[PDB]
Amino acid sequence: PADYFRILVQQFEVQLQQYRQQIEELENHLATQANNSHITPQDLSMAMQKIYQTFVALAAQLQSIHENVKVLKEQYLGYRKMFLG
Amino acid sequence: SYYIDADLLREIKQHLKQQQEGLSHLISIIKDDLEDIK
Amino acid sequence: YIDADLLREIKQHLKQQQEGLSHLISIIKDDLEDIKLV
């Protein structure tokens, strides 16, 4: 677990926790009828724009994780050809 | 890469702005908040 | 309220977000699995 790998796993967990909280907050608001009455339509407009900004971040991280696991396989394949044939 | 419908997203925006809130209700929520926080 | 059509719109949008992330996760899982297969 080098720095590059560690910063990603950490930066990836904080966005994961945000997204988790934001969704649950929204689902609960839209869950019951009486619950929606306790928030204005412009609160949704916020929540929506907040969850999306997070989603975009999460999607970016998952994409970069895909890139890392890809070089891992390539290096791993490189070494194998060197020492195993 | 991630596919998400943009037309649907801005459509959600419109519906949110179009819909208006009753001022009398808007104030009841504010009061409730202040109290619920203090 | 809130409007029911705006609810189905929101639900569809959030569902699209999940499908997007899940897809990426699936690609990652494939990568990890193929590593073991080499």
Enumerate domains of chain A plus CATH numbers. Answer: 1-85 (6.10.140.1350)
Q: Are C16 and A50 in contact (CB under 8 A)?
A: no
State the sign of the Cα–Cα–Cα–Cα dihedral A67, A68, A70, A74. Answer: positive
Question: How many structural domains does chain C have?
Answer: 1
> What part of B 1-38 touches C (C-beta under 8 Å)?
2-5, 8-9, 11-12, 15-16, 19
List the domain range (segments joined by +) for residue C29: 1-38
The tokens describing B25, both together, are: 């209700």
> For this experimental structure, what is the resolution in angstroms?
2.5
What's the rounded Cα separation, in Å, for the pair C23 and B11?
A: 24
What's the rounded Cα separation, in Å, for the pair B31 and B1?
A: 44
Q: Identify which of A26, A58, A65 has the shortest CB distance to residue C28.
A: A65
Residues of B in contact with A38 (CB under 8 A): 29, 32
Q: Which amino acid is at C10?
A: I
